[PDB]
Structures are given as structure tokens and as C-alpha cells.
Design a protein around this nucleic acid. Structure first.
Length: 160
DNA sequence: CCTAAGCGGCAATCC
DNA sequence: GGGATTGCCGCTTAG
């Protein structure tokens, strides 16, 4: 839905700048959370009827060691511009403001992260993201960088 | 009245 | 019983 494509030249100009704030967010291989929300309990109502997590539903659970650092966007909404040229809204939420998610749709961040893993042939549908998934991809961290716009961050996840 | 999931927080764990 | 951290689950609210 609310996704925008940014031209490779506007991306070059944007990513050329230096960042006041920057964080290296681990791509965790936890099995019922983070990248692998798909393999956790679904959403169950009071009558016990459950609803499977979508494949692209993800979160980046960010440790306090990082969210407590100077400049981190705690409980803010903000624009994210990816290194491969996509723009969408993300939101930090939950206790310690640990949950890094795309806003209004959890799948958007998932389509970005997983769709990237899929394209490079490191991940196929309904598969767990493991150390070897990330090792084959060539990256196990997300770069969250600031721009001179307080509400726009750069998000990177380059592979091999 | 609903249903569905965005996102807030529960709870398992380790001190 | 308490706090501190964060996987993980499902409450609550907007549609």
C-alpha cells in the first residue's frame, strides 16, 4: 500500500550524506519472534479460534543496549528509505520501545527483508531464517541511520 | 452487532 | 515476593 519507489540517483544522493545517529540492529534468528514471527502462535480469540501469522509478518526486536543510546527513535513514527530504493513508514512500539516494525502493516517490512532473502535464493516460502540463511546472504545486521530530516531514517540490508 | 491485526504488553527467564 | 530484559502472545480498537 503506502510504499514508494525511490530512483537510484535520489538514493545515491541520500545515502552519500553522513549520519548524526547510526545503529547496527542484529538480524536475530529467534524461532517464534523477530524474523520468524510466522512460526510462533497465531492470533487466538476468546473462543479459542486461531489465525496463523502471515509469512511476511516480522519485527525487529531491538535490545535496550541500542534503544537507550542517544538519538534512537523511541515510540516515534518515521519514514524509512531503504538502500535498494524503497520508502515506507515504520513505528517503534512495545516495552523499552524494542519492537521495530513497519507501520499499519507488519508485512511491508517483511516483504522487504524476506523478499530480499528470497531473491538472492537464501530463503524459500515457509522456511525458518537461520544463521546459515544470513551467512549465505552475507549480512546479519540492519543499519538504521539518521538524515537531516528528523522523521526520515535510512535502513540498509545489503547481501552478497 | 461484528471481525481482524496493529501494536502494546504479557510472561518466561535470569538473575 | 522483587527488578530487568525481551521472546512471544493476544488484548483492544479501528475499520
Amino acid at each position: 500500500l503506502g510504499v514508494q519507489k525511490i530512483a537510484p540517483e535520489q538514493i545515491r544522493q541520500l545515502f552519500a550524506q553522513t549520519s548524526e545517529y547510526h545503529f547496527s540492529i542484529p538480524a536475530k534468528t529467534e524461532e517464534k519472534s523477530n524474523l520468524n514471527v510466522f512460526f510462533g502462535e497465531g492470533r487466538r480469540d476468546k473462543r479459542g479460534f486461531v489465525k496463523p501469522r502471515p509469512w511476511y509478518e516480522v519485527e525487529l526486536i531491538v535490545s535496550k543496549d541500542i534503544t537507550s543510546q542517544e538519538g534512537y527513535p523511541v515510540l516515534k513514527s518515521f519514514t524509512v528509505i531503504t538502500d535498494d530504493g524503497w520508502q515506507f513508514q515504520c513505528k517503534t512500539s512495545g516495552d523499552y520501545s524494542k519492537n521495530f516494525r513497519s507501520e499499519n502493516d507488519l508485512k511491508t517490512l517483511g516483504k522487504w527483508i524476506k523478499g530480499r532473502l528470497e531473491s538472492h535464493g537464501c530463503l524459500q516460502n515457509n522456511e525458518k531464517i537461520t544463521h546459515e540463511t544470513l551467512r549465505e546472504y552475507g549480512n546479519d545486521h540492519f543499519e538504521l541511520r539518521s538524515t537531516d530530516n528528523p522523521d526520515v531514517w535510512l535502513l540498509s540490508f545489503k547481501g552478497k
